[PDB]
Amino acid sequence: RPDFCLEPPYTGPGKARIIRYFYNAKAGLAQTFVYGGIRAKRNNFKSAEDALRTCGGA
């Protein structure tokens, strides 16, 4: 699994409130979180399906 997949979600320093997805490795599912619009970490997807294809595991 890529190393970032186990990291908590990162809103970042931006003031926007955009709904993104992170891989929740303990649930084994994607979850939404609020993203501030800049300086993303890599556990940050535009869709559940992208989160699972990247981080769901072989």
JSON list of N, CA and C in Angstrom, two decimals:
[
{"chain": "A", "resi": 1, "resn": "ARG", "atom": "N", "xyz": [0.89, -1.19, 0.00]},
{"chain": "A", "resi": 1, "resn": "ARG", "atom": "CA", "xyz": [0.00, 0.00, 0.00]},
{"chain": "A", "resi": 1, "resn": "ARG", "atom": "C", "xyz": [0.93, 1.24, 0.00]},
{"chain": "A", "resi": 2, "resn": "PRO", "atom": "N", "xyz": [0.69, 2.29, -0.85]},
{"chain": "A", "resi": 2, "resn": "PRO", "atom": "CA", "xyz": [1.53, 3.46, -0.77]},
{"chain": "A", "resi": 2, "resn": "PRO", "atom": "C", "xyz": [1.57, 4.02, 0.66]},
{"chain": "A", "resi": 3, "resn": "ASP", "atom": "N", "xyz": [2.70, 4.62, 1.07]},
{"chain": "A", "resi": 3, "resn": "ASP", "atom": "CA", "xyz": [2.91, 4.99, 2.44]},
{"chain": "A", "resi": 3, "resn": "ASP", "atom": "C", "xyz": [1.89, 6.11, 2.91]},
{"chain": "A", "resi": 4, "resn": "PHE", "atom": "N", "xyz": [1.49, 6.93, 2.04]},
{"chain": "A", "resi": 4, "resn": "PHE", "atom": "CA", "xyz": [0.61, 7.99, 2.41]},
{"chain": "A", "resi": 4, "resn": "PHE", "atom": "C", "xyz": [-0.77, 7.50, 2.80]},
{"chain": "A", "resi": 5, "resn": "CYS", "atom": "N", "xyz": [-1.14, 6.30, 2.39]},
{"chain": "A", "resi": 5, "resn": "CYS", "atom": "CA", "xyz": [-2.52, 5.84, 2.56]},
{"chain": "A", "resi": 5, "resn": "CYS", "atom": "C", "xyz": [-2.96, 5.69, 3.95]},
{"chain": "A", "resi": 6, "resn": "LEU", "atom": "N", "xyz": [-1.96, 5.57, 4.88]},
{"chain": "A", "resi": 6, "resn": "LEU", "atom": "CA", "xyz": [-2.25, 5.39, 6.32]},
{"chain": "A", "resi": 6, "resn": "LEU", "atom": "C", "xyz": [-2.22, 6.69, 7.11]},
{"chain": "A", "resi": 7, "resn": "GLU", "atom": "N", "xyz": [-1.94, 7.77, 6.42]},
{"chain": "A", "resi": 7, "resn": "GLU", "atom": "CA", "xyz": [-1.83, 9.12, 7.10]},
{"chain": "A", "resi": 7, "resn": "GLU", "atom": "C", "xyz": [-3.18, 9.69, 7.33]},
{"chain": "A", "resi": 8, "resn": "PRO", "atom": "N", "xyz": [-3.37, 10.50, 8.39]},
{"chain": "A", "resi": 8, "resn": "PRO", "atom": "CA", "xyz": [-4.67, 11.13, 8.59]},
{"chain": "A", "resi": 8, "resn": "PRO", "atom": "C", "xyz": [-4.91, 12.15, 7.41]},
{"chain": "A", "resi": 9, "resn": "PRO", "atom": "N", "xyz": [-6.20, 12.50, 7.27]},
{"chain": "A", "resi": 9, "resn": "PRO", "atom": "CA", "xyz": [-6.45, 13.55, 6.27]},
{"chain": "A", "resi": 9, "resn": "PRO", "atom": "C", "xyz": [-5.84, 14.90, 6.67]},
{"chain": "A", "resi": 10, "resn": "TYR", "atom": "N", "xyz": [-5.54, 15.71, 5.70]},
{"chain": "A", "resi": 10, "resn": "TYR", "atom": "CA", "xyz": [-4.84, 17.01, 5.92]},
{"chain": "A", "resi": 10, "resn": "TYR", "atom": "C", "xyz": [-5.66, 18.10, 5.30]},
{"chain": "A", "resi": 11, "resn": "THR", "atom": "N", "xyz": [-6.35, 18.92, 6.07]},
{"chain": "A", "resi": 11, "resn": "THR", "atom": "CA", "xyz": [-7.04, 20.06, 5.57]},
{"chain": "A", "resi": 11, "resn": "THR", "atom": "C", "xyz": [-6.15, 21.07, 4.93]},
{"chain": "A", "resi": 12, "resn": "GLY", "atom": "N", "xyz": [-4.98, 21.29, 5.54]},
{"chain": "A", "resi": 12, "resn": "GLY", "atom": "CA", "xyz": [-4.06, 22.31, 5.14]},
{"chain": "A", "resi": 12, "resn": "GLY", "atom": "C", "xyz": [-4.41, 23.72, 5.59]},
{"chain": "A", "resi": 13, "resn": "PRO", "atom": "N", "xyz": [-3.59, 24.69, 5.18]},
{"chain": "A", "resi": 13, "resn": "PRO", "atom": "CA", "xyz": [-3.68, 26.05, 5.69]},
{"chain": "A", "resi": 13, "resn": "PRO", "atom": "C", "xyz": [-4.68, 26.84, 4.94]},
{"chain": "A", "resi": 14, "resn": "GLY", "atom": "N", "xyz": [-5.27, 26.35, 3.86]},
{"chain": "A", "resi": 14, "resn": "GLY", "atom": "CA", "xyz": [-6.23, 27.14, 3.07]},
{"chain": "A", "resi": 14, "resn": "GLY", "atom": "C", "xyz": [-7.52, 27.33, 3.76]},
{"chain": "A", "resi": 15, "resn": "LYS", "atom": "N", "xyz": [-8.23, 28.35, 3.33]},
{"chain": "A", "resi": 15, "resn": "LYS", "atom": "CA", "xyz": [-9.51, 28.74, 3.96]},
{"chain": "A", "resi": 15, "resn": "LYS", "atom": "C", "xyz": [-10.71, 28.23, 3.24]},
{"chain": "A", "resi": 16, "resn": "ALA", "atom": "N", "xyz": [-10.51, 27.56, 2.10]},
{"chain": "A", "resi": 16, "resn": "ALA", "atom": "CA", "xyz": [-11.65, 26.96, 1.38]},
{"chain": "A", "resi": 16, "resn": "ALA", "atom": "C", "xyz": [-12.18, 25.74, 2.20]},
{"chain": "A", "resi": 17, "resn": "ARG", "atom": "N", "xyz": [-13.34, 25.30, 1.75]},
{"chain": "A", "resi": 17, "resn": "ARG", "atom": "CA", "xyz": [-13.97, 24.12, 2.39]},
{"chain": "A", "resi": 17, "resn": "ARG", "atom": "C", "xyz": [-14.48, 23.21, 1.32]},
{"chain": "A", "resi": 18, "resn": "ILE", "atom": "N", "xyz": [-13.59, 22.49, 0.66]},
{"chain": "A", "resi": 18, "resn": "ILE", "atom": "CA", "xyz": [-13.92, 21.60, -0.45]},
{"chain": "A", "resi": 18, "resn": "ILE", "atom": "C", "xyz": [-13.99, 20.20, 0.08]},
{"chain": "A", "resi": 19, "resn": "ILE", "atom": "N", "xyz": [-14.95, 19.40, -0.35]},
{"chain": "A", "resi": 19, "resn": "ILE", "atom": "CA", "xyz": [-15.11, 18.07, 0.15]},
{"chain": "A", "resi": 19, "resn": "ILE", "atom": "C", "xyz": [-14.28, 17.12, -0.66]},
{"chain": "A", "resi": 20, "resn": "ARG", "atom": "N", "xyz": [-13.29, 16.49, -0.05]},
{"chain": "A", "resi": 20, "resn": "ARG", "atom": "CA", "xyz": [-12.42, 15.50, -0.65]},
{"chain": "A", "resi": 20, "resn": "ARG", "atom": "C", "xyz": [-12.59, 14.21, 0.11]},
{"chain": "A", "resi": 21, "resn": "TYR", "atom": "N", "xyz": [-11.86, 13.18, -0.43]},
{"chain": "A", "resi": 21, "resn": "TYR", "atom": "CA", "xyz": [-11.86, 11.84, 0.13]},
{"chain": "A", "resi": 21, "resn": "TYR", "atom": "C", "xyz": [-10.47, 11.44, 0.61]},
{"chain": "A", "resi": 22, "resn": "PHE", "atom": "N", "xyz": [-10.41, 10.78, 1.73]},
{"chain": "A", "resi": 22, "resn": "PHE", "atom": "CA", "xyz": [-9.17, 10.12, 2.19]},
{"chain": "A", "resi": 22, "resn": "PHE", "atom": "C", "xyz": [-9.47, 8.64, 2.35]},
{"chain": "A", "resi": 23, "resn": "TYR", "atom": "N", "xyz": [-8.45, 7.81, 2.16]},
{"chain": "A", "resi": 23, "resn": "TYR", "atom": "CA", "xyz": [-8.51, 6.39, 2.51]},
{"chain": "A", "resi": 23, "resn": "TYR", "atom": "C", "xyz": [-8.40, 6.22, 3.96]},
{"chain": "A", "resi": 24, "resn": "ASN", "atom": "N", "xyz": [-9.42, 5.69, 4.59]},
{"chain": "A", "resi": 24, "resn": "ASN", "atom": "CA", "xyz": [-9.41, 5.41, 6.11]},
{"chain": "A", "resi": 24, "resn": "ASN", "atom": "C", "xyz": [-8.91, 3.93, 6.29]},
{"chain": "A", "resi": 25, "resn": "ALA", "atom": "N", "xyz": [-7.57, 3.71, 6.42]},
{"chain": "A", "resi": 25, "resn": "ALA", "atom": "CA", "xyz": [-7.08, 2.37, 6.42]},
{"chain": "A", "resi": 25, "resn": "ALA", "atom": "C", "xyz": [-7.63, 1.39, 7.49]},
{"chain": "A", "resi": 26, "resn": "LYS", "atom": "N", "xyz": [-8.01, 1.93, 8.59]},
{"chain": "A", "resi": 26, "resn": "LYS", "atom": "CA", "xyz": [-8.67, 1.07, 9.63]},
{"chain": "A", "resi": 26, "resn": "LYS", "atom": "C", "xyz": [-10.05, 0.67, 9.18]},
{"chain": "A", "resi": 27, "resn": "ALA", "atom": "N", "xyz": [-10.82, 1.51, 8.47]},
{"chain": "A", "resi": 27, "resn": "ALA", "atom": "CA", "xyz": [-12.15, 1.07, 7.96]},
{"chain": "A", "resi": 27, "resn": "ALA", "atom": "C", "xyz": [-12.00, 0.32, 6.70]},
{"chain": "A", "resi": 28, "resn": "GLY", "atom": "N", "xyz": [-10.93, 0.53, 5.92]},
{"chain": "A", "resi": 28, "resn": "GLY", "atom": "CA", "xyz": [-10.80, -0.05, 4.59]},
{"chain": "A", "resi": 28, "resn": "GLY", "atom": "C", "xyz": [-11.72, 0.53, 3.52]},
{"chain": "A", "resi": 29, "resn": "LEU", "atom": "N", "xyz": [-12.18, 1.77, 3.79]},
{"chain": "A", "resi": 29, "resn": "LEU", "atom": "CA", "xyz": [-13.09, 2.52, 2.94]},
{"chain": "A", "resi": 29, "resn": "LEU", "atom": "C", "xyz": [-12.61, 3.94, 2.83]},
{"chain": "A", "resi": 30, "resn": "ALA", "atom": "N", "xyz": [-13.00, 4.63, 1.79]},
{"chain": "A", "resi": 30, "resn": "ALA", "atom": "CA", "xyz": [-12.86, 6.09, 1.66]},
{"chain": "A", "resi": 30, "resn": "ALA", "atom": "C", "xyz": [-13.84, 6.83, 2.50]},
{"chain": "A", "resi": 31, "resn": "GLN", "atom": "N", "xyz": [-13.45, 7.98, 3.04]},
{"chain": "A", "resi": 31, "resn": "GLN", "atom": "CA", "xyz": [-14.29, 8.85, 3.89]},
{"chain": "A", "resi": 31, "resn": "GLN", "atom": "C", "xyz": [-14.10, 10.29, 3.36]},
{"chain": "A", "resi": 32, "resn": "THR", "atom": "N", "xyz": [-15.10, 11.12, 3.49]},
{"chain": "A", "resi": 32, "resn": "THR", "atom": "CA", "xyz": [-14.98, 12.53, 3.14]},
{"chain": "A", "resi": 32, "resn": "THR", "atom": "C", "xyz": [-14.29, 13.32, 4.27]},
{"chain": "A", "resi": 33, "resn": "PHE", "atom": "N", "xyz": [-13.70, 14.43, 3.87]},
{"chain": "A", "resi": 33, "resn": "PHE", "atom": "CA", "xyz": [-13.14, 15.41, 4.82]},
{"chain": "A", "resi": 33, "resn": "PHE", "atom": "C", "xyz": [-13.12, 16.77, 4.11]},
{"chain": "A", "resi": 34, "resn": "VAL", "atom": "N", "xyz": [-12.93, 17.78, 4.96]},
{"chain": "A", "resi": 34, "resn": "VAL", "atom": "CA", "xyz": [-12.89, 19.16, 4.43]},
{"chain": "A", "resi": 34, "resn": "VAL", "atom": "C", "xyz": [-11.46, 19.50, 4.09]},
{"chain": "A", "resi": 35, "resn": "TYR", "atom": "N", "xyz": [-11.20, 19.95, 2.86]},
{"chain": "A", "resi": 35, "resn": "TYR", "atom": "CA", "xyz": [-9.95, 20.35, 2.34]},
{"chain": "A", "resi": 35, "resn": "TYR", "atom": "C", "xyz": [-9.90, 21.85, 2.11]},
{"chain": "A", "resi": 36, "resn": "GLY", "atom": "N", "xyz": [-8.80, 22.50, 2.57]},
{"chain": "A", "resi": 36, "resn": "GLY", "atom": "CA", "xyz": [-8.72, 23.97, 2.48]},
{"chain": "A", "resi": 36, "resn": "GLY", "atom": "C", "xyz": [-8.30, 24.54, 1.18]},
{"chain": "A", "resi": 37, "resn": "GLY", "atom": "N", "xyz": [-8.08, 23.73, 0.18]},
{"chain": "A", "resi": 37, "resn": "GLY", "atom": "CA", "xyz": [-7.91, 24.21, -1.18]},
{"chain": "A", "resi": 37, "resn": "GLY", "atom": "C", "xyz": [-6.52, 24.35, -1.65]},
{"chain": "A", "resi": 38, "resn": "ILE", "atom": "N", "xyz": [-5.49, 24.14, -0.85]},
{"chain": "A", "resi": 38, "resn": "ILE", "atom": "CA", "xyz": [-4.10, 24.30, -1.24]},
{"chain": "A", "resi": 38, "resn": "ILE", "atom": "C", "xyz": [-3.25, 23.38, -0.37]},
{"chain": "A", "resi": 39, "resn": "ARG", "atom": "N", "xyz": [-2.10, 23.01, -0.92]},
{"chain": "A", "resi": 39, "resn": "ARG", "atom": "CA", "xyz": [-1.04, 22.26, -0.22]},
{"chain": "A", "resi": 39, "resn": "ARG", "atom": "C", "xyz": [-1.47, 20.85, 0.26]},
{"chain": "A", "resi": 40, "resn": "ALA", "atom": "N", "xyz": [-2.16, 20.17, -0.64]},
{"chain": "A", "resi": 40, "resn": "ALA", "atom": "CA", "xyz": [-2.66, 18.81, -0.36]},
{"chain": "A", "resi": 40, "resn": "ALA", "atom": "C", "xyz": [-1.55, 17.86, 0.06]},
{"chain": "A", "resi": 41, "resn": "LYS", "atom": "N", "xyz": [-1.86, 16.92, 0.90]},
{"chain": "A", "resi": 41, "resn": "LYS", "atom": "CA", "xyz": [-1.05, 15.71, 1.10]},
{"chain": "A", "resi": 41, "resn": "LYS", "atom": "C", "xyz": [-1.60, 14.68, 0.08]},
{"chain": "A", "resi": 42, "resn": "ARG", "atom": "N", "xyz": [-0.94, 13.54, 0.03]},
{"chain": "A", "resi": 42, "resn": "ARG", "atom": "CA", "xyz": [-1.29, 12.59, -1.01]},
{"chain": "A", "resi": 42, "resn": "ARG", "atom": "C", "xyz": [-2.54, 11.71, -0.68]},
{"chain": "A", "resi": 43, "resn": "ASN", "atom": "N", "xyz": [-2.92, 11.59, 0.59]},
{"chain": "A", "resi": 43, "resn": "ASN", "atom": "CA", "xyz": [-4.17, 10.90, 0.99]},
{"chain": "A", "resi": 43, "resn": "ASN", "atom": "C", "xyz": [-5.35, 11.85, 0.80]},
{"chain": "A", "resi": 44, "resn": "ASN", "atom": "N", "xyz": [-5.58, 12.26, -0.45]},
{"chain": "A", "resi": 44, "resn": "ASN", "atom": "CA", "xyz": [-6.54, 13.32, -0.78]},
{"chain": "A", "resi": 44, "resn": "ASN", "atom": "C", "xyz": [-6.99, 13.05, -2.21]},
{"chain": "A", "resi": 45, "resn": "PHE", "atom": "N", "xyz": [-8.22, 12.64, -2.38]},
{"chain": "A", "resi": 45, "resn": "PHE", "atom": "CA", "xyz": [-8.77, 12.16, -3.68]},
{"chain": "A", "resi": 45, "resn": "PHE", "atom": "C", "xyz": [-10.01, 12.92, -3.96]},
{"chain": "A", "resi": 46, "resn": "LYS", "atom": "N", "xyz": [-10.35, 13.01, -5.25]},
{"chain": "A", "resi": 46, "resn": "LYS", "atom": "CA", "xyz": [-11.61, 13.65, -5.63]},
{"chain": "A", "resi": 46, "resn": "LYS", "atom": "C", "xyz": [-12.79, 12.76, -5.56]},
{"chain": "A", "resi": 47, "resn": "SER", "atom": "N", "xyz": [-12.55, 11.45, -5.38]},
{"chain": "A", "resi": 47, "resn": "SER", "atom": "CA", "xyz": [-13.65, 10.45, -5.36]},
{"chain": "A", "resi": 47, "resn": "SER", "atom": "C", "xyz": [-13.33, 9.28, -4.47]},
{"chain": "A", "resi": 48, "resn": "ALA", "atom": "N", "xyz": [-14.33, 8.61, -3.96]},
{"chain": "A", "resi": 48, "resn": "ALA", "atom": "CA", "xyz": [-14.07, 7.36, -3.22]},
{"chain": "A", "resi": 48, "resn": "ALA", "atom": "C", "xyz": [-13.34, 6.36, -4.08]},
{"chain": "A", "resi": 49, "resn": "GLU", "atom": "N", "xyz": [-13.76, 6.21, -5.35]},
{"chain": "A", "resi": 49, "resn": "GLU", "atom": "CA", "xyz": [-13.20, 5.21, -6.22]},
{"chain": "A", "resi": 49, "resn": "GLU", "atom": "C", "xyz": [-11.71, 5.41, -6.48]},
{"chain": "A", "resi": 50, "resn": "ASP", "atom": "N", "xyz": [-11.28, 6.67, -6.59]},
{"chain": "A", "resi": 50, "resn": "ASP", "atom": "CA", "xyz": [-9.86, 6.92, -6.74]},
{"chain": "A", "resi": 50, "resn": "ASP", "atom": "C", "xyz": [-9.09, 6.55, -5.46]},
{"chain": "A", "resi": 51, "resn": "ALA", "atom": "N", "xyz": [-9.65, 6.89, -4.31]},
{"chain": "A", "resi": 51, "resn": "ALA", "atom": "CA", "xyz": [-9.02, 6.51, -3.04]},
{"chain": "A", "resi": 51, "resn": "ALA", "atom": "C", "xyz": [-8.84, 5.02, -2.95]},
{"chain": "A", "resi": 52, "resn": "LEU", "atom": "N", "xyz": [-9.85, 4.26, -3.36]},
{"chain": "A", "resi": 52, "resn": "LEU", "atom": "CA", "xyz": [-9.75, 2.78, -3.24]},
{"chain": "A", "resi": 52, "resn": "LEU", "atom": "C", "xyz": [-8.85, 2.27, -4.34]},
{"chain": "A", "resi": 53, "resn": "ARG", "atom": "N", "xyz": [-8.83, 2.76, -5.52]},
{"chain": "A", "resi": 53, "resn": "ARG", "atom": "CA", "xyz": [-7.95, 2.20, -6.50]},
{"chain": "A", "resi": 53, "resn": "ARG", "atom": "C", "xyz": [-6.49, 2.43, -6.09]},
{"chain": "A", "resi": 54, "resn": "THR", "atom": "N", "xyz": [-6.17, 3.59, -5.49]},
{"chain": "A", "resi": 54, "resn": "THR", "atom": "CA", "xyz": [-4.79, 3.93, -5.13]},
{"chain": "A", "resi": 54, "resn": "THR", "atom": "C", "xyz": [-4.39, 3.22, -3.87]},
{"chain": "A", "resi": 55, "resn": "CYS", "atom": "N", "xyz": [-5.26, 3.18, -2.87]},
{"chain": "A", "resi": 55, "resn": "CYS", "atom": "CA", "xyz": [-4.89, 2.82, -1.50]},
{"chain": "A", "resi": 55, "resn": "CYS", "atom": "C", "xyz": [-5.50, 1.61, -0.95]},
{"chain": "A", "resi": 56, "resn": "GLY", "atom": "N", "xyz": [-6.44, 1.00, -1.70]},
{"chain": "A", "resi": 56, "resn": "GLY", "atom": "CA", "xyz": [-7.15, -0.16, -1.21]},
{"chain": "A", "resi": 56, "resn": "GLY", "atom": "C", "xyz": [-6.37, -1.41, -1.01]},
{"chain": "A", "resi": 57, "resn": "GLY", "atom": "N", "xyz": [-5.25, -1.52, -1.68]},
{"chain": "A", "resi": 57, "resn": "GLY", "atom": "CA", "xyz": [-4.31, -2.69, -1.48]},
{"chain": "A", "resi": 57, "resn": "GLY", "atom": "C", "xyz": [-4.48, -3.67, -2.59]},
{"chain": "A", "resi": 58, "resn": "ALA", "atom": "N", "xyz": [-3.44, -4.48, -2.79]},
{"chain": "A", "resi": 58, "resn": "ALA", "atom": "CA", "xyz": [-3.46, -5.49, -3.86]},
{"chain": "A", "resi": 58, "resn": "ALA", "atom": "C", "xyz": [-4.40, -6.66, -3.55]}
]
